[PDB]
From a paper:
Here we present rotamer inverted fragment finder–diffusion (Riff-Diff), a hybrid machine learning and atomistic modelling strategy for scaffolding catalytic arrays in de novo proteins.
We obtained crystal structures of the four designs: RAD13 (kcat = 3.8 × 10−5 s−1), RAD17 (kcat not determined), RAD32 (kcat = 1.1 × 10−2 s−1), and RAD36 (kcat = 6.2 × 10−5 s−1). The crystal structures agree with the design models, having backbone Cα RMSD values between 0.68 Å and 1.2 Å. Despite the near-atomic precision with which the tetrad was reproduced, RAD13 and RAD17 were more than 105-fold slower than RA95.5-8F.
Numbering used by the authors: 2 to 198
Write the structure that this text describes.
Amino acid sequence: TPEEEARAAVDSFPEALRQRAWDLNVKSAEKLAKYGIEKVTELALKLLKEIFEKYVEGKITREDLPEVVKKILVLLSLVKATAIYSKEGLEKILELLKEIAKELRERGETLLAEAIDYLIEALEKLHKGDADGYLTLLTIALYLYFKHIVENGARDPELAAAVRPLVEGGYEAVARYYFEVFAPKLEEGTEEAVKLF
């Protein structure tokens, strides 16, 4: 099963590295939880809606890419804080993501919709405190996201070319990218979120 294979990929990496990623998520969540979980959730919902509305309208150009990544990093930091500390807030964020995934599927962005389904599942594992289950589902969500970029690479061929080795390398390559590149960037998202308050 995709979940079993991705999980196997996650377990092949050193425990210390996985523990670092987990500890980093929790520290970011505590930093954001200091600002009120209701406020964190409200901001998360606002940013999620903005990003989705802009995306569907095709107003994200290649020139726009650095700013959107920053907005996503903030959104993920806020959402993760909510997943750790508020079931009700989490339920609202998840409900919205399910609607977005359905809409994207109806629009034919099927891989992106699948990526979002797996993000939703990862957030539920995060809420339950399952670090390995979280990293497994997050790896699948990133893999599907990159696959979406490669299948749509006509929109940014260079970006497709950059992430293609990750797709060709499978869940192991995606997990490797996460541990070595993505997880350290979480702090960047947290800092931008702090600035918003």
